Structure formats: structure tokens, C-alpha cells
A paper describes a structure:
In the ethanologenic bacterium Zymomonas mobilis ZM4, the gene ZMO0922 encodes a 148 amino acid polypeptide, which has been annotated as a putative ASCH domain-containing protein (ZmASCH) that belongs to family 23. Here, we report the three-dimensional crystal structure of ZmASCH which confirms the fold of a central β-barrel core and reveals a positively-charged cleft with a pocket on the surface. In vitro assays showed that ZmASCH bound nucleic acids and possessed cleavage activity specifically towards single-stranded RNAs. The weak nuclease activity of ZmASCH depended on magnesium ions and the protein appeared to prefer the consecutive pyrimidine-adenine dinucleotides for its cleavage activity.
Numbering used by the authors: 3 to 147
Write the structure that this text describes.
């Protein structure tokens, strides 16, 4: 359940979301964010115009470091451009990197479907923990692409 932090949802722009579930993007950079447990399943919500859960991946490592060293070490796996990285971290010296593995694309679970699982679902700005029952219903709708 939620205290275990094994099931979470994050939101990504469509080109980055699709890059995670295809395995091209294996690092996700964040500022301050609740940290999941290791081996947590991270469901990928793709924002407008897709507005759907389109896959998931598993968290294999959490890195916390300084902005410039993380770009050097992990920027190529993170898919975004250097300008987009500097924009996002403008105003802090600290960065967090999620290292992901075992990406799995699924048939999109659209917004109305997610609203049956969670009445007031909104795309998380950072990360939202899934309740046991919420994870159950989500798994019940997972199908191959």
C-alpha cells in the first residue's frame, strides 16, 4: 500500500513519456519529489494531447547530486536537450535523477478510465502514490499495444 511506495504515477509531456516506455529515455530528472522505494513501478502518464497512462517502468536507482555533474553523467539517457535541462533546474544547485529499467508500453488507459479508478484524478505535478485498490483496477486494464 501507500506507506510502501511501490506504485506511483508521474506525468510527462508526450514525446518524453513515449521515450520512457520505448526505452530510449532511461533517466528522469526532477527537483524536489517524494522518493519511491527501490524497484517501485512508475506508471507513465502522458499529458496533452495524449492524456493517458501509456506504460510503466521500474525504478532501479535514485541519484541525488549537483546540477552540472548530473548533466555530464546522465544527460544522454535523459533525452531532453541541454537548454531544457538548464531551464528546468534554473535557480537550484541540486538535482535528482530516477534511473529506470524494464520499460513496458501498454494500450493507453485514457482519462475517463482513470477517473473511474480515482474520482478526482489529476495528472500529478510531481508524483502520486497509488492505493492498493487503485493499483488493482489499473492492472486489470493493462493490455499489450
Amino acid at each position: 500500500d501507500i506507506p510502501d511506495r511501490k506504485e506511483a504515477v508521474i506525468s510527462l509531456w508526450p514525446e518524453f513519456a513515449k521515450a520512457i516506455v520505448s526505452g530510449k529515455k532511461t533517466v528522469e530528472f526532477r527537483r524536489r519529489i517524494p522518493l519511491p522505494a527501490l524497484s517501485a513501478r512508475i506508471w507513465i502518464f502522458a499529458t496533452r494531447p495524449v492524456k493517458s497512462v501509456i506504460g510503466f517502468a521500474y525504478l532501479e536507482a535514485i541519484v541525488q547530486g549537483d546540477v552540472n555533474t548530473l548533466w555530464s553523467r546522465y544527460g544522454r539517457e535523459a533525452f531532453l536537450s541541454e537548454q531544457q535541462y538548464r531551464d528546468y533546474f534554473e535557480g537550484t544547485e541540486k538535482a535528482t535523477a530516477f534511473l529506470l529499467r524494464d520499460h513496458q508500453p501498454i494500450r493507453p488507459i485514457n482519462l475517463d478510465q482513470l477517473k473511474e479508478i480515482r474520482a478526482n484524478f489529476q495528472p500529478p505535478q510531481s508524483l502520486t502514490w497509488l492505493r492498493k485498490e487503485e493499483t488493482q483496477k489499473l492492472v486489470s486494464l493493462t493490455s499489450q499495444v
